[PDB]
Write a protein that binds this ligand. Structure first.
Ligand SMILES: [Cl-]
Length: 180
């Protein structure tokens, strides 16, 4: 309708994190902005970078915080205000531990799944009733702490699929926006 959506892709800054598991949200957000013809630019009132557009007749504000994952939420809250976006209309794209590799799921409200970005977001919005585009990376092997697992690059085999999984992740996001 008239209410604008804020799509946020979670991730850590710096090239060396660009390919880590905890950066799929970043990649997807880039993908979307590319499809929209919109481009990112600094947002001094939130410390994040935004790109604006229109999908399925809805006004879109794409975003990628520039702080670290554990601080993601502090740039989204001020961002939600600047553009007058209710938490219900916030969509955060993210790698998901509770989902297996390549599996994509739309979801609104619920748990954080052990992801430190989401936790930061909940604590910043004072609610979990925000939308999510979950991109599965499967659970970590017993030999890796979940937090170290996501800060690592995908395996040789996995890397072959990430490109396609992101296009699919972007597609699922477009469908989510289109449905409500
Ligand atoms: Cl500004």
């Amino acid at each position: 309708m008239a209410e604008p959506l804020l799509v946020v892709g979670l991730g850590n800054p710096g090239a060396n994190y660009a390919r880590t598991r905890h950066n799929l949200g970043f990649v997807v957000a880039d993908l979307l902005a590319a499809r929209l013809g919109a481009k990112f630019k600094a947002h001094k009132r939130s410390g994040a970078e935004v790109a604006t557009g229109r999908s399925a007749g809805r006004s879109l504000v794409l975003a990628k915080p520039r702080c670290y994952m554990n601080e993601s939420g502090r740039q989204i809250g001020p961002l939600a205000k600047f553009y007058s976006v209710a938490p219900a209309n916030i969509i955060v794209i993210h790698d998901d531990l509770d989902l297996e590799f390549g599996r994509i799921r739309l979801k609104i409200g619920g748990g954080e799944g052990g992801h430190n970005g989401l936790r930061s977001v909940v604590a910043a919005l004072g609610t979990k009733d925000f939308q999510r585009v979950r991109i599965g990376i499967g659970r970590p092997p017993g030999r890796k702490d979940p937090a170290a697992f996501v800060l690592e690059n995908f395996t040789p085999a996995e890397r072959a699929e990430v490109p396609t999984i992101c296009e699919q992740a972007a597609d699922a996001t477009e469908l989510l926006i289109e449905q409500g």
